[PDB]
Design a protein around this nucleic acid. Structure first.
Ligand SMILES: [Mg+2]
Ligand SMILES: [Mg+2]
Ligand SMILES: [Mg+2]
Ligand SMILES: [Mg+2]
Ligand SMILES: [Mg+2]
Ligand SMILES: [Mg+2]
Length: 70
RNA sequence: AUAUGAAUUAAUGCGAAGUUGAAAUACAGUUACCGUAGGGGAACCUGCGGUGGGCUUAUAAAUAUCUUAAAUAUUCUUACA
Protein backbone atom coordinates (compact mmCIF):
# COMPACT_ATOMS: atom_id res chain seq x y z
CA UNK A 1 0.00 0.00 0.00
CA UNK A 2 2.49 2.65 1.20
CA UNK A 3 5.97 1.10 1.32
CA UNK A 4 9.07 2.89 2.62
CA UNK A 5 7.06 4.87 5.17
CA UNK A 6 8.40 4.79 8.73
CA UNK A 7 5.56 5.24 11.26
CA UNK A 8 6.00 7.41 14.33
CA UNK A 9 6.10 6.35 17.98
CA UNK A 10 2.93 6.52 20.06
CA UNK A 11 4.58 8.96 22.48
CA UNK A 12 5.40 11.44 19.69
CA UNK A 13 2.87 13.22 17.44
CA UNK A 14 1.90 12.48 13.86
CA UNK A 15 4.52 13.33 11.26
CA UNK A 16 3.77 15.26 8.08
CA UNK A 17 3.43 12.06 6.05
CA UNK A 18 1.32 10.43 8.75
CA UNK A 19 -0.89 13.53 8.72
CA UNK A 20 -1.18 13.20 4.94
CA UNK A 21 -2.26 9.57 5.14
CA UNK A 22 -4.62 10.38 8.02
CA UNK A 23 -6.38 13.12 6.07
CA UNK A 24 -6.51 10.81 3.04
CA UNK A 25 -8.33 8.28 5.21
CA UNK A 26 -10.64 11.11 6.24
CA UNK A 27 -11.11 12.25 2.63
CA UNK A 28 -12.17 8.87 1.28
CA UNK A 29 -14.69 8.19 4.08
CA UNK A 30 -16.06 11.23 5.91
CA UNK A 31 -15.11 14.32 3.89
CA UNK A 32 -17.93 13.57 1.43
CA UNK A 33 -20.56 13.31 4.18
CA UNK A 34 -23.53 15.64 4.40
CA UNK A 35 -24.97 15.82 0.90
CA UNK A 36 -24.65 14.38 -2.58
CA UNK A 37 -24.18 16.78 -5.49
CA UNK A 38 -26.56 16.50 -8.43
CA UNK A 39 -27.08 18.31 -11.74
CA UNK A 40 -23.71 20.08 -11.60
CA UNK A 41 -21.23 20.16 -14.47
CA UNK A 42 -17.77 18.71 -13.85
CA UNK A 43 -15.29 19.43 -16.69
CA UNK A 44 -13.39 16.14 -16.44
CA UNK A 45 -16.51 14.00 -16.88
CA UNK A 46 -16.92 15.04 -20.53
CA UNK A 47 -13.68 13.16 -21.16
CA UNK A 48 -14.14 10.08 -18.96
CA UNK A 49 -17.95 9.70 -19.09
CA UNK A 50 -18.98 10.93 -22.54
CA UNK A 51 -22.54 9.92 -23.47
CA UNK A 52 -23.57 7.56 -26.24
CA UNK A 53 -24.57 9.18 -29.55
CA UNK A 54 -28.20 8.07 -29.17
CA UNK A 55 -28.53 9.80 -25.77
CA UNK A 56 -27.42 13.26 -26.94
CA UNK A 57 -30.11 15.93 -26.92
CA UNK A 58 -30.17 19.47 -28.25
CA UNK A 59 -30.14 20.65 -24.63
CA UNK A 60 -26.84 18.91 -23.82
CA UNK A 61 -25.25 20.25 -27.01
CA UNK A 62 -26.45 23.72 -26.02
CA UNK A 63 -25.21 23.44 -22.44
CA UNK A 64 -21.78 22.58 -23.87
CA UNK A 65 -21.91 25.75 -25.96
CA UNK A 66 -21.78 23.95 -29.31
CA UNK A 67 -24.34 26.38 -30.76
CA UNK A 68 -22.17 29.49 -30.34
CA UNK A 69 -20.81 30.41 -33.76
CA UNK A 70 -18.34 32.99 -34.96
C1' A B 1 -10.37 62.61 -118.43
C1' U B 2 -6.44 59.11 -118.69
C1' A B 3 -1.66 56.97 -119.53
C1' U B 4 3.73 57.53 -120.80
C1' G B 5 8.68 60.04 -120.60
C1' A B 6 10.98 63.90 -118.37
C1' A B 7 15.57 68.28 -116.90
C1' U B 8 15.23 69.38 -111.88
C1' U B 9 13.34 67.96 -107.18
C1' A B 10 11.02 65.88 -101.60
C1' A B 11 10.91 61.85 -98.69
C1' U B 12 11.98 57.17 -97.19
C1' G B 13 14.14 51.90 -96.81
C1' C B 14 18.37 48.78 -96.72
C1' G B 15 23.67 47.08 -96.21
C1' A B 16 29.64 47.01 -94.78
C1' A B 17 32.86 48.54 -91.64
C1' G B 18 33.09 52.65 -88.92
C1' U B 19 32.10 58.09 -86.93
C1' U B 20 30.03 61.44 -83.68
C1' G B 21 26.31 63.19 -79.11
C1' A B 22 24.97 61.53 -74.10
C1' A B 23 18.51 62.01 -75.38
C1' A B 24 15.82 57.35 -73.13
C1' U B 25 15.85 52.82 -69.84
C1' A B 26 18.13 53.37 -62.26
C1' C B 27 15.87 59.37 -58.81
C1' A B 28 19.46 57.54 -66.36
C1' G B 29 22.21 62.09 -62.74
C1' U B 30 17.31 68.46 -65.31
C1' U B 31 10.93 62.85 -63.53
C1' A B 32 9.36 60.66 -68.33
C1' C B 33 5.54 61.06 -71.73
C1' C B 34 0.84 63.57 -74.42
C1' G B 35 -0.70 68.14 -76.70
C1' U B 36 0.97 72.81 -78.38
C1' A B 37 4.56 76.97 -79.23
C1' G B 38 9.54 79.02 -79.92
C1' G B 39 14.88 77.82 -80.67
C1' G B 40 18.32 74.29 -82.94
C1' G B 41 21.42 71.42 -88.82
C1' A B 42 19.78 67.40 -85.86
C1' A B 43 20.00 64.61 -81.15
C1' C B 44 17.62 67.77 -78.29
C1' C B 45 16.71 72.65 -75.17
C1' U B 46 12.98 75.96 -73.26
C1' G B 47 7.70 77.85 -72.09
C1' C B 48 2.12 76.48 -70.76
C1' G B 49 -1.46 72.73 -69.24
C1' G B 50 -2.36 67.45 -68.71
C1' U B 51 -1.14 62.14 -67.30
C1' G B 52 1.52 58.34 -63.92
C1' G B 53 2.81 54.74 -67.86
C1' G B 54 7.26 58.31 -60.36
C1' C B 55 6.96 58.68 -55.51
C1' U B 56 -0.03 54.10 -51.75
C1' U B 57 7.71 53.28 -52.35
C1' A B 58 2.42 54.38 -47.37
C1' U B 59 4.23 51.06 -40.89
C1' A B 60 3.79 53.85 -32.57
C1' A B 61 4.74 60.46 -28.57
C1' A B 62 5.59 54.78 -25.02
C1' U B 63 3.13 53.10 -19.06
C1' A B 64 -3.05 48.51 -16.72
C1' U B 65 -6.31 45.95 -11.49
C1' C B 66 -8.48 43.00 -5.03
C1' U B 67 -10.79 37.12 -2.45
C1' U B 68 -11.46 32.49 -0.03
C1' A B 69 -4.41 28.57 -3.75
C1' A B 70 -6.11 23.97 -1.92
C1' A B 71 -8.03 18.63 3.90
C1' U B 72 -11.11 22.20 -1.85
C1' A B 73 -8.84 23.16 -8.34
C1' U B 74 -5.17 20.14 -10.82
C1' U B 75 -6.58 13.26 -10.15
C1' C B 76 -10.90 10.91 -12.49
C1' U B 77 -11.72 5.56 -17.64
C1' U B 78 -19.41 4.60 -18.33
C1' A B 79 -18.94 5.68 -12.85
C1' C B 80 -22.17 7.65 -10.14
C1' A B 81 -26.40 9.66 -9.85
MG1 LIG C 1 20.95 61.11 -70.19
MG1 LIG D 1 16.42 62.50 -67.59
MG1 LIG E 1 18.11 77.58 -76.72
MG1 LIG F 1 -7.67 65.78 -67.47
MG1 LIG G 1 10.43 56.07 -63.13
MG1 LIG H 1 4.22 52.27 -59.51
Amino acid sequence: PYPNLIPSANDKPYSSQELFLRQLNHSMRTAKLGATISKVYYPHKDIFYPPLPENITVESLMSAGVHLGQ
